[PDB]
Amino acid sequence: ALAKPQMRGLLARRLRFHIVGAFMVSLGFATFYKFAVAEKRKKAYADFYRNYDSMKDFEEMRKAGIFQSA
Amino acid sequence: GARTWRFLTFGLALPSVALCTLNSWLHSGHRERPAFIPYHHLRIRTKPFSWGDGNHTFFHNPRVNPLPTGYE
Amino acid sequence: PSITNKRIVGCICEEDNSTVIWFWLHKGEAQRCPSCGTHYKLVP
Amino acid sequence: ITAKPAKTPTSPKEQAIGLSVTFLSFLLPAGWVLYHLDNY
Amino acid sequence: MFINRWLFSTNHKDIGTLYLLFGAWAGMVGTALSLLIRAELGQPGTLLGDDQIYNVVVTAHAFVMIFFMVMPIMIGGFGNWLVPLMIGAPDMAFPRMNNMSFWLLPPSFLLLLASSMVEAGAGTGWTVYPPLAGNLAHAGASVDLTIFSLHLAGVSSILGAINFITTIINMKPPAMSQYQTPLFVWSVMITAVLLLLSLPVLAAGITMLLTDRNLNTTFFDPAGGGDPILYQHLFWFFGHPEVYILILPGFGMISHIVTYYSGKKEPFGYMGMVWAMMSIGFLGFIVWAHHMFTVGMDVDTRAYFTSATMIIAIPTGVKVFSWLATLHGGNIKWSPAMMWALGFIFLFTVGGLTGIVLANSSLDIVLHDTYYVVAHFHYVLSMGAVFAIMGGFVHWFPLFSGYTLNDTWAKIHFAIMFVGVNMTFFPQHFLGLSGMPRRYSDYPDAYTMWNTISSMGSFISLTAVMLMVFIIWEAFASKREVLTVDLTTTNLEWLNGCPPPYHTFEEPTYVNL
Amino acid sequence: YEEGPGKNIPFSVENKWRLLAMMTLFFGSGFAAPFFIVRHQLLK
Amino acid sequence: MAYPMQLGFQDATSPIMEELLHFHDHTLMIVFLISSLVLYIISLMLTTKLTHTSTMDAQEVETIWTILPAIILILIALPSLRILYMMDEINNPSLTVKTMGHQWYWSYEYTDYEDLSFDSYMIPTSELKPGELRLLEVDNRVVLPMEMTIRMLVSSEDVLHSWAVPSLGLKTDAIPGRLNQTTLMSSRPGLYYGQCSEICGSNHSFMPIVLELVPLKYFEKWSASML
Amino acid sequence: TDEEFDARWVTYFNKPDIDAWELRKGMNTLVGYDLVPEPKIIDAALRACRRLNDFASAVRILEVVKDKAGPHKEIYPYVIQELRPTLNELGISTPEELGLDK
Amino acid sequence: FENRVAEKQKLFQEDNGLPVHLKGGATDNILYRVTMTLCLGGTLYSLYCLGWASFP
Amino acid sequence: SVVKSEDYALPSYVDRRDYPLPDVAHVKNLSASQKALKEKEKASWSSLSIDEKVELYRLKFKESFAEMNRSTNEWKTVVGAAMFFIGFTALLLIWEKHYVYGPIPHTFEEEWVAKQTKRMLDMKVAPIQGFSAKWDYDKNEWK
Amino acid sequence: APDFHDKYGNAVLASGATFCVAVWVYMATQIGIEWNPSPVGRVTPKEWR
Ligand code: HEA
Ligand code: HEA
Ligand SMILES: CCCCC/C=C/C/C=C/C/C=C/C/C=C\CCCC(=O)O[C@H](COC(=O)CCCCCCCCCCCCCCCCC)COP(=O)(O)OCCN
Ligand SMILES: CCCCCC/C=C\CCCCCCCCCC(=O)O[C@H](COC(=O)CCCCCCCCCCCCCCC)COP(=O)(O)OC[C@@H](O)CO
Ligand SMILES: CCCCCCCCCCO[C@@H]1O[C@H](CO)[C@@H](O[C@H]2O[C@H](CO)[C@@H](O)[C@H](O)[C@H]2O)[C@H](O)[C@H]1O
Ligand SMILES: CCCCCCCCCCO[C@@H]1O[C@H](CO)[C@@H](O[C@H]2O[C@H](CO)[C@@H](O)[C@H](O)[C@H]2O)[C@H](O)[C@H]1O
Ligand SMILES: CCCCCCCCCCO[C@@H]1O[C@H](CO)[C@@H](O[C@H]2O[C@H](CO)[C@@H](O)[C@H](O)[C@H]2O)[C@H](O)[C@H]1O
Ligand SMILES: C[C@H](CCC(=O)O)[C@H]1CC[C@H]2[C@@H]3[C@H](O)C[C@@H]4C[C@H](O)CC[C@]4(C)[C@H]3C[C@H](O)[C@]12C
Ligand SMILES: C[C@H](CCC(=O)O)[C@H]1CC[C@H]2[C@@H]3[C@H](O)C[C@@H]4C[C@H](O)CC[C@]4(C)[C@H]3C[C@H](O)[C@]12C
Ligand code: CUA
Ligand SMILES: [Ca+2]
Numbered sequence A: 001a002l003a004k005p006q007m008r009g010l011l012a013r014r015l016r017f018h019i020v021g022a023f024m025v026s027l028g029f030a031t032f033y034k035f036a037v038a039e040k041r042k043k044a045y046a047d048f049y050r051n052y053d054s055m056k057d058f059e060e061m062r063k064a065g066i067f068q069s070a
Numbered sequence B: 001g002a003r004t005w006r007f008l009t010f011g012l013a014l015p016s017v018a019l020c021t022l023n024s025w026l027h028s029g030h031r032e033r034p035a036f037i038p039y040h041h042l043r044i045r046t047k048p049f050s051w052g053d054g055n056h057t058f059f060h061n062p063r064v065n066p067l068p069t070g071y072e
Numbered sequence C: 001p002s003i004t005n006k007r008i009v010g011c012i013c014e015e016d017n018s019t020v021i022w023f024w025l026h027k028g029e030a031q032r033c034p035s036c037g038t039h040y041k042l043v044p
Numbered sequence D: 001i002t003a004k005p006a007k008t009p010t011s012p013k014e015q016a017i018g019l020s021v022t023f024l025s026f027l028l029p030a031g032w033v034l035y036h037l038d039n040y
Numbered sequence E: 001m002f003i004n005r006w007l008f009s010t011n012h013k014d015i016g017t018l019y020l021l022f023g024a025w026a027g028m029v030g031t032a033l034s035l036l037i038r039a040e041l042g043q044p045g046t047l048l049g050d051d052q053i054y055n056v057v058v059t060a061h062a063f064v065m066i067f068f069m070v071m072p073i074m075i076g077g078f079g080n081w082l083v084p085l086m087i088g089a090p091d092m093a094f095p096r097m098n099n100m101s102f103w104l105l106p107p108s109f110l111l112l113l114a115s116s117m118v119e120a121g122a123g124t125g126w127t128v129y130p131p132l133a134g135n136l137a138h139a140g141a142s143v144d145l146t147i148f149s150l151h152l153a154g155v156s157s158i159l160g161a162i163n164f165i166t167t168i169i170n171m172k173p174p175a176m177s178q179y180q181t182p183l184f185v186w187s188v189m190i191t192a193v194l195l196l197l198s199l200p201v202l203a204a205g206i207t208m209l210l211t212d213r214n215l216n217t218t219f220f221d222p223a224g225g226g227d228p229i230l231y232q233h234l235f236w237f238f239g240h241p242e243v244y245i246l247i248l249p250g251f252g253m254i255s256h257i258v259t260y261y262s263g264k265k266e267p268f269g270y271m272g273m274v275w276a277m278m279s280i281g282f283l284g285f286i287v288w289a290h291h292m293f294t295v296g297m298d299v300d301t302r303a304y305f306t307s308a309t310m311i312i313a314i315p316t317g318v319k320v321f322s323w324l325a326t327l328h329g330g331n332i333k334w335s336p337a338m339m340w341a342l343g344f345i346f347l348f349t350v351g352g353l354t355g356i357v358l359a360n361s362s363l364d365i366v367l368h369d370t371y372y373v374v375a376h377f378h379y380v381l382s383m384g385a386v387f388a389i390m391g392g393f394v395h396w397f398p399l400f401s402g403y404t405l406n407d408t409w410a411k412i413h414f415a416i417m418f419v420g421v422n423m424t425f426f427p428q429h430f431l432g433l434s435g436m437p438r439r440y441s442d443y444p445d446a447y448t449m450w451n452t453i454s455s456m457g458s459f460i461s462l463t464a465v466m467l468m469v470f471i472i473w474e475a476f477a478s479k480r481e482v483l484t485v486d487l488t489t490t491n492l493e494w495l496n497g498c499p500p501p502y503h504t505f506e507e508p509t510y511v512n513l
Numbered sequence F: 001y002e003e004g005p006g007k008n009i010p011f012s013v014e015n016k017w018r019l020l021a022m023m024t025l026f027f028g029s030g031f032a033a034p035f036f037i038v039r040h041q042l043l044k
Numbered sequence G: 001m002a003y004p005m006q007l008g009f010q011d012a013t014s015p016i017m018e019e020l021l022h023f024h025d026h027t028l029m030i031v032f033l034i035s036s037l038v039l040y041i042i043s044l045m046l047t048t049k050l051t052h053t054s055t056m057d058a059q060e061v062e063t064i065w066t067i068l069p070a071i072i073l074i075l076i077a078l079p080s081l082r083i084l085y086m087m088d089e090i091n092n093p094s095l096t097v098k099t100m101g102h103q104w105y106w107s108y109e110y111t112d113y114e115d116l117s118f119d120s121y122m123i124p125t126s127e128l129k130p131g132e133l134r135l136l137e138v139d140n141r142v143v144l145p146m147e148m149t150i151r152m153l154v155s156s157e158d159v160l161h162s163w164a165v166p167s168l169g170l171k172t173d174a175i176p177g178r179l180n181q182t183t184l185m186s187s188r189p190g191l192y193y194g195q196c197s198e199i200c201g202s203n204h205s206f207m208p209i210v211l212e213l214v215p216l217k218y219f220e221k222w223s224a225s226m227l
Numbered sequence H: 001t002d003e004e005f006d007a008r009w010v011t012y013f014n015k016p017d018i019d020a021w022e023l024r025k026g027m028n029t030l031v032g033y034d035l036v037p038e039p040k041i042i043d044a045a046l047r048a049c050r051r052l053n054d055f056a057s058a059v060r061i062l063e064v065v066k067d068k069a070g071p072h073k074e075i076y077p078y079v080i081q082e083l084r085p086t087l088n089e090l091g092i093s094t095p096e097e098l099g100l101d102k
Numbered sequence I: 001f002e003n004r005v006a007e008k009q010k011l012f013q014e015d016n017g018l019p020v021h022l023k024g025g026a027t028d029n030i031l032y033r034v035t036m037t038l039c040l041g042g043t044l045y046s047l048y049c050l051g052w053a054s055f056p
Numbered sequence J: 001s002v003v004k005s006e007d008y009a010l011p012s013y014v015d016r017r018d019y020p021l022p023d024v025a026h027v028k029n030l031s032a033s034q035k036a037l038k039e040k041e042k043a044s045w046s047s048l049s050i051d052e053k054v055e056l057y058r059l060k061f062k063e064s065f066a067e068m069n070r071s072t073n074e075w076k077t078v079v080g081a082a083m084f085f086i087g088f089t090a091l092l093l094i095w096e097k098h099y100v101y102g103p104i105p106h107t108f109e110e111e112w113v114a115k116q117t118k119r120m121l122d123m124k125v126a127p128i129q130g131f132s133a134k135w136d137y138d139k140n141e142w143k
Numbered sequence K: 001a002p003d004f005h006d007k008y009g010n011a012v013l014a015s016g017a018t019f020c021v022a023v024w025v026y027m028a029t030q031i032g033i034e035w036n037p038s039p040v041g042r043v044t045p046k047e048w049r
């Protein structure tokens, strides 16, 4: 004989399972995006400016002949 | 009908109140009180008030309402 | 009532339902709303 | 929906003619103008 | 008989048919204009000319797509055909005035094509801002012909709004409350209220522009104490409601299509859908200055317009979620109309979300007058309004004509158009973020790759438009007559057959209390 | 007035080839117009 | 300036443009997540033969549908309005420069001390020098001191224009009879490009903006030499 | 509760003088719910088919049980197992026994 | 003056198949023909005027 | 069974998995043998043959669930045809390139692009992430 | 009774895919379209002054 399977609320059961899965995935994407885009950007700007020498940058540009004024 | 006025109550009126409550509750912080200047057109005393020491307004707030002689 | 042998009925099955159930009612035996089973009879 | 079979069936060949004429009606006049832009 | 029927109509169906024919013709004009835009932008360097001929094309593209394609199809066409049938009414309240709403459009269109033929055209943008649109920088008849075009279109729509509001309020079965009318009917009533209140303000503003141009007024001319920014406030007080007017009937059609092809008797959350459309209509009047974040207004004003604009996401989200909840548990029929509707839900959501990005005045400084704005509005117009039009057209074509489309051809059509519109507009986000301005005939070399791909997209969409003409031909050529239609118990417009007789509901419906 | 499929329209569908010509002229004229307007502006 | 195949914003040259990049990152994450969730839910609603077609109760679920979007909007508005009010803060500029839009070029006025003014026109394609950028170079650049708060005032002597420099986060409409203010502060020397950002007729595409950011001493000598 | 729902539906189909309209209304309504009906409900509907001399509708009811289970392939064989005594008593052939699963 | 509404009610309800814009008799036909002639002729003139205004 | 336009207002036959028992029988008119079969149906169904049971099903219904629910090859036609028309679109783009589009500006010439690239690196275009950030100024090569 | 899709679907899918790829590859590579790709990792910078 076959056992009695679950016969009620199959659509509701499927929805609950997948909406929880989608919340869990949304959280993983938010964490990945934090790392791969937002923090990467903050770090790129912080690293660029940490020891940035604007006069040295200008001297390089001037010696390359880019300016009208210098 | 009643159904329409209930719809306006819950769909327009109370949402408006909630939005204005959110707005107020964001600008609820205490502002820096202004320097006391004993201006003659303010803190009027032509007769003592009929309560307390006669020199405090009815809803006197020590933080923001100076007396004629200044902040307490 | 009808001036012909069929008329469209709309059935508001329960008070305040937003969904109206529409069907042709034909001359002859009473027909039932296919949602609530309410009986309608054409009187041409 | 259900429907009758076509009263005047349009064969694959007839559809190729209709599709061809329709596309040419859009493409040839614009094509002529854009080809002659240098002349304008 | 032909003149009596088609020039002297007092019949809501025939007038609806005239609007659909007009809107279809207007769509071909608008598509040709769009292809001229993308032909110029598809290679760096000048193809056509300097920015004047280019912006005449851009200006005309917008006025044609908005005033001659979308509004006549959604409101004049679907509204006239469906609203009386969905409330069991024997016609519109003012069936002769309805005919004049239609016949004002060919003359309006003629004035727009005259604008482009005389002098150097109206190269103003569809916003027609002064002083570029004034009598010094646009001397001669072109802008005056554009203003008069808009006056005739405005009168058409104002009288149409009066007709729809009166019909929907006054001509329902006596047992039917407003809360027992279908969502499409609500969407037209709300659109009509927006038209009634917004178009007169446009009329005032463009009349002031006409008098500045011809009667030596100075409403917008600082030499007389006027202000060009006043024109912008008057235009946008109309213009933001106008975009809700373009989408609301689309939302109503999507609710009917999703319900129908889900096998449902009713949309999810009817009263929430009504609430959402009325909330969108209301909020649409208090947000117009999000079109003006770079003009120099005060910071507190920018903060208000940012916040009020964002609020529109709440009722709009209720509609999106309610469509998804209508699909939930459906017996899904993968009809061509359903494919248009599903495309709508997703692509409209994307465009709405880029609108929320733009609502932020601080970021809008960098995005204003760039292709980011162009990407936003084409997701909501070319993938929203248009997808609702195509879904409603393929859904109701058998009602209107009595003949069926070839469903396989209609699915092919959808597939091609989906690829083309996404290839056209998705890359415009990148052009916007990287700073390509609007209304440019030519661009710095860096922007070449995305402009090239965007133009290739536009050619795919042209292929779809040409195929659609063929598909309508094949339906009329083959004459497959309708036999049975499912779900008539919750779709009254189908219950009088395909097509319905000239006179329907001569004997009204019976609905008791 | 004539009622039914093919009769509630201001154009004839009695002959599919005549209809193809009419539809070609109708939609083709709308699509062509902007190209001819641009040509007109360029030729001034 | 923009570079080939660019996806996002020009690299920030000013602190406010930096702020706008991080705010755009935050907003775009939300846009991605909501778009993705709607697409996923569509795909979920469409991939089962299981059915439920009887009337469904809406009020519980509508609470979630309104409250969660309201929270998300607040999470966008708070940083949005922080940046809006940061750009509006009092700063104390060292220099005021005016720009006037014309059909089709920009004029610049540096009148704090001397009557310095000049016109700035696009370099025609046929006259570009090797390595120069089509439609972006001008004959006379807007030379400015780096690392200094500058007040820019913008107007027009004809139709509307709009003065934009994307890498500094700037776009200010140029309206006749109106003097609009913005602040400009470059973290770096170099050349920063923009383009007219309000339709202004025949040569709207062809009236660009080039800022040349140099040390104060060089700016002072250039200023003297331009009188 | 589940038991009250099932008992209401058993009562519905067990009405001795149930008419053809009521049989159809009941089945067309029941298949809108998020459930595969319990064997006791299907048993009562099949006996209504017998009182209404309608063999074909009895077969169609078995098909819609299979359909309502969707991808849950274990439900229909279980339901048929539970119905076998009723199918044998009434001479109802399954869709499979009639080749109507092809 | 006298109330002659009943006489107009009889005229406009006559079962003669005329649409309401012509049911007053021959004067209605004349005024219709004048109106439509000025409309169609003016429209043709407006198109000539466009033809003229379309060229320098 | 012949379905008629003039029956639109009457209850009709449908095959829908969500409406298993439609409003009318598929076949209403009965031959002599079909009438005898409907009489036989009033007696024990155990006495009906398999063929009689199938015949009774096919009077009541048009298609079985298995038939009405079948999958089709239509997706191949739709996808193939869509790819054909997208392919046709590339012919229009080839025509445009050949007959409409003249030479592109001289700033796209290889030598111009090489010089412009160096000048962008000399002015440090997008030095944080976008462009110059990708150049190694120490080794004089792309990173 | 095989329908149009049973008889022709395989050929329509295979021919449409083959045609689409061939013509777009030809268009993209053989007719001088200027894509203006990134110079990064591609272009050797050259003296301009
Ligand atoms: C409804 C509005 C709408 C629609 C649909 C479109 C559709 C398209 N638009 Fe746009 N467009 C605007 C409104 C619209 N547009 C506006 C308002 C502007 C700004 C103007 C300004 O700056 O002043 C604009 C600007 C604009 C630009 C920016 C120009 C610039 O700044 O220089 C570009 C660039 O590519 C563009 C391209 C296109 C393309 C390729 C399509 C294609 O996707 C079109 C493809 C074709 C269709 C979508 C079918 C159309 C026909 C029908 C639907 C009829 C169907 C028939 C029946 C139902 C019987 N348009
Ligand atoms: C049908 C047309 C249409 C529609 C419906 C919209 C809808 C919106 N638009 Fe758009 N818009 C245009 C057509 C449209 N727009 C046009 C033509 C222009 C350019 C005019 C010109 O200059 O020529 C434009 C310009 C425009 C600007 C000016 C930008 C500039 O010029 O710099 C802004 C600014 O805020 C704006 C914002 C919005 C917003 C917030 C919505 C909202 O209504 C969108 C709301 C929808 C959603 C948000 C998606 C669904 C919601 C959810 C799934 C819930 C969860 C979401 C969140 C929590 C965010 N749009
Ligand atoms: C919270 C919502 C509103 C509440 C209303 C008021 C509450 C208390 C009093 C009730 C009666 C009010 C009516 C109007 C009368 C006058 C003053 C009321 C306004 C009030 O409450 O004002 C207060 C002062 O009250 C004061 O002096 C003293 C107030 C008490 C004495 C009042 C005596 C005067 C009565 C006059 C009667 C005339 C009646 C007219 C009849 C006409 C018939 C022909 C303000 O506080 P404050 O500290 O100065 O400033 C705030 C600083 N942080
Ligand atoms: C620069 C120059 C540009 C100007 C362009 C002018 C535009 C068009 C020319 C106008 C020609 C008007 C001719 C008269 C129209 C009368 C309409 C009318 O009176 O319509 C009535 C309905 O509207 C009603 O009542 C109430 C509404 C009546 C409105 C009447 C006329 C409006 C005209 C202009 C309105 C614009 C508004 C300005 C504010 C923005 C009657 O409806 P019918 O369907 O006829 O009959 C129904 C039957 O049951 C009656 O027995
Ligand atoms: C954006 C919408 C349009 C997209 C592109 C449309 C594709 C073009 C379709 C073809 O158009 C035709 O092309 C021909 C050339 O291939 C032209 O003939 C021209 O060239 C021929 C060959 O050199 C000559 O014989 C003819 O006289 C001469 O007009 C002809 O006029 C034109 O109709
Ligand atoms: C039922 C059909 C409808 C009737 C259509 C009638 C059309 C015929 C009108 C005659 O045309 C006129 O010709 C005059 C030429 O003499 C023009 O004079 C004007 O132009 C002159 C040019 O010489 C100037 O002297 C003056 O501005 C002015 O008199 C005037 O503009 C124009 O109307
Ligand atoms: C870039 C945008 C791309 C758009 C792509 C468009 C693809 C078009 C697919 C058409 O293919 C068919 O789709 C039917 C539906 O239209 C399927 O129905 C089958 O599957 C369905 C299950 O969802 C059932 O409802 C049906 O009964 C059943 O016949 C059928 O087998 C399949 O060949
Ligand atoms: C009261 C009214 C109509 C109810 C009815 O008569 O059927 C309903 C319809 C839509 C409802 C609103 C919408 O569902 C959107 C919001 C949902 C929240 O959970 C409550 C507030 C909220 C704003 C609702 C309040 C109220 O319940 C509304 C306005
Ligand atoms: C004599 C006539 C009777 C009308 C009638 O009942 O048929 C009267 C009644 C009301 C009169 C009108 C009103 O008295 C108002 C006006 C009075 C003026 O002194 C003459 C014109 C004037 C407009 C009158 C004209 C005419 O004498 C009217 C119309
Ligand atoms: Cu100056 Cu655009
Ligand atoms: Ca070009």
Ligand SMILES: [Cu+2]
Pocket: E239, E240, E243, E287, E288, E290, E291
């Ligand atoms: Cu807006």
Ligand SMILES: [Mg+2]
Pocket: E294, E368, E369, G162, G197, G198
């Ligand atoms: Mg602007």
Ligand SMILES: [Zn+2]
Pocket: C011, C012, C013, C021, C033, C034, C035, C036, C037, C038
């Ligand atoms: Zn009922």
